[PDB]
Amino acid sequence: MAATVCTIADMTVDMVRRTVIRSGKKIHLTGKEYVLLELLLQRTGEVLPRSLISSLVWNMNFDSDTNVIDVAVRRLRSKIDDDFEPKLIHTVRGAGYVLEIREE
């Protein structure tokens, strides 16, 4: 009926609560990591830019903040998702960054 929650291979994303429940266990992160996932999950299903995300934490700019965004997602992913969930990180050459499972 309504659409306020997206399920994955083995997790539960909340577009209204902005959270992720893995096998019934909510993942914990920091402010920066929370921002990266906040937008990623919020815009789950579609590729979004990086300049915007960086603005939600550090700031916006025509250049790249030492690729802190990409590194923030990869560093946080290998922090727990390294074994928790599979490689759900996917990027489209000529778009930005998006989250999704390959099983789909």
Write the layout of secondary structure elements.
Elements: E1 6-8, E2 11-13, E3 20-22, E4 25-26, H1 31-42, H2 50-57, H3 68-81, E5 89-90, E6 98-99
Antiparallel strand pairs: 1-2, 2-3, 3-4, 5-6
Helix pairs in contact: 1-2, 1-3
PDB class: transcription
Keywords: two-component-system response regulator, effector domain, DNA-binding, Phosphoprotein, Plasmid, Transcription, Transcription regulation, Two-component regulatory system
Assembly: monomeric
Task: Give a verbal description of the structure.
It is classed as transcription. The entry lists the keywords two-component-system response regulator, effector domain, DNA-binding, Phosphoprotein, Plasmid, Transcription, Transcription regulation, Two-component regulatory system. It forms a monomeric assembly. The entry is titled "Solution structure of C-terminal effector domain of putative two-component-system response regulator involved in copper resistance from Klebsiella pneumoniae". This protein has 104 residues and is α+β, with helices and mostly antiparallel strands. Helix 1 packs antiparallel against helix 2 and helix 1 crosses helix 3. The strands form 2 sheets. A 4-stranded antiparallel β-sheet has the order 1-2-3-4, with no helix packed on it. The two termini are 22 Å apart. It has one domain: Winged helix-like DNA-binding domain superfamily/Winged helix DNA-binding domain (Arc Repressor Mutant, subunit A, Orthogonal Bundle), CATH 1.10.10. The radius of gyration is 13 Å and the shape is globular.
